Ligand binder design. Sequence first.
Ligand SMILES: *C(=O)N1C[C@H](NOS(=O)(=O)O)CC[C@H]1C(N)=O
Length: 250
Amino acid sequence: VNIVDYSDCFEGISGGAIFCNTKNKEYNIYNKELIETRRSPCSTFKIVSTLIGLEKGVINSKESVMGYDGTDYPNKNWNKNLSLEEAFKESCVWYYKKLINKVDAKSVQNILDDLKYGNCDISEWEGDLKNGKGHLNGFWLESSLQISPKEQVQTMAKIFEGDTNFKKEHINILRDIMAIDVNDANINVYGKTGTGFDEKNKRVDAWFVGMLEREGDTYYFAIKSDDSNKEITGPKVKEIAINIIKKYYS
Ligand SMILES: *C(=O)N1C[C@H](NOS(=O)(=O)O)CC[C@H]1C(N)=O
């Protein structure tokens, strides 16, 4: 465990980072207190909910559809019968809500328990209804389920090193749809953003979680901001994460 200083890449934004290479158990940690603090995963839960849906047969491939019903949404790309790949990349809430609501709560509880997914608390299945957004809510969106950045990395490692019971075919579907382009062909980066606002503490939950492959070595990582500035989003923390990867992990 090496404590490191990534502050320059954070460019004044409050946050922390953890990178882990499980081949040589080297843990690089910036802001240890924050890296161990549990918070809502927000849209980073799509990594796990995709695997749940695949395991239960609700979806089957990166083409799979969830039967769009014509409801009007402000994001143009949500207004279609989009595939799993598109729903993941567009963070389509209705698709992932419909997917998870086809799965019984005990199945979800047991999968989160097996993954050690933070507090594994799905008690508020409906999510944070007091925000007024109704069915555009759930236990993983600023609600009962909470996970620390370190636990995110531990979960990512368990999944992608083949240490869970999820099918290898399903893990490869997730790998494919998580791949991002960082304009450097010598590293393969995979990840997912998440954005929430913690109404209790007046702080954002801005995430980028994923993995980095660079010539035989693999690093599992989680970058997290808790800034009070509502402008700080998942996509913004992904930029920060990419800056760290290019500076320290290339
Ligand atoms: C996920 O955190 N969410 C879904 C959607 N995409 O967020 S992301 O760009 O950080 O991946 C909008 C924000 C949030 C939500 N409100 O559900």
